[PDB]
């Protein structure tokens, strides 16, 4: 009975089946959320590479971590990088399909390091919810701050 939630908290500390990292298209350890991901999945960096607006999944042991290339708006222009971060959350919702899991944990890609200097909390969890809309998983969103827990939270309510 698939929902979405969203948890205050490290994503490296996620209790679901598999994560999402918002990763670079180099493969390489990165800021933000792929530094977290690197600290606590190192394995998962073998051949993680994959360009912009794709997922490629690399398994860690049993666990599954869904590489996830959304664009850096400092590159793109607002119109490309658009496309590019609905092309990488669609290729996110093939994975978790192919991998056949009961849930992911999963952070909003192309904010932060790769937001360009703009609030994209809207933006990224419109593209992650159109995109995993058609998952039967639970997708549990992980953020740090208490305000975008509280929008990501009442965005879901108004949706579900």
């Given at each position: 009975a698939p929902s979405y939630r969203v948890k205050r908290m490290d994503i490296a500390k996620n209790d679901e089946e598999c994560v999402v990292n918002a990763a670079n298209p180099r493969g390489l350890p990165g800021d933000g959320v792929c530094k977290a991901v690197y600290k606590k999945w190192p394995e998962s960096?073998?051949?993680?590479?994959?360009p912009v607006g794709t997922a490629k999944t690399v398994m860690?042991?049993?666990?599954?971590?869904?590489?996830?290339?959304?664009?850096?708006?400092?590159?793109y222009s607002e119109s490309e990088g658009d496309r590019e971060l609905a092309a990488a959350y669609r290729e996110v919702a093939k994975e978790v399909t192919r991998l056949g899991v009961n849930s992911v944990a999963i952070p909003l890609l192309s904010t932060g390091v790769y937001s360009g200097g703009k609030?994209?909390?809207?933006?990224?969890?419109?593209?992650?919810?159109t995109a995993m809309d058609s998952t039967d998983a639970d997708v549990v969103i992980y953020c740090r701050d208490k305000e975008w827990e509280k929008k990501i939270s009442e965005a879901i309510q108004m949706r579900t």
């Amino acid at each position: 009975a698939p929902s979405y939630r969203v948890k205050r908290m490290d994503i490296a500390k996620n209790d679901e089946e598999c994560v999402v990292n918002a990763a670079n298209p180099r493969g390489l350890p990165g800021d933000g959320v792929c530094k977290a991901v690197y600290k606590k999945w190192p394995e998962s960096f073998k051949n993680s590479a994959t360009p912009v607006g794709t997922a490629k999944t690399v398994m860690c042991g049993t666990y599954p971590v869904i590489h996830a290339v959304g664009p850096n708006f400092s590159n793109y222009s607002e119109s490309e990088g658009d496309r590019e971060l609905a092309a990488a959350y669609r290729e996110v919702a093939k994975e978790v399909t192919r991998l056949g899991v009961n849930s992911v944990a999963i952070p909003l890609l192309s904010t932060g390091v790769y937001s360009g200097g703009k609030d994209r909390l809207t933006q990224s969890l419109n593209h992650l919810f159109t995109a995993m809309d058609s998952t039967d998983a639970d997708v549990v969103i992980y953020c740090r701050d208490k305000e975008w827990e509280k929008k990501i939270s009442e965005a879901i309510q108004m949706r579900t």
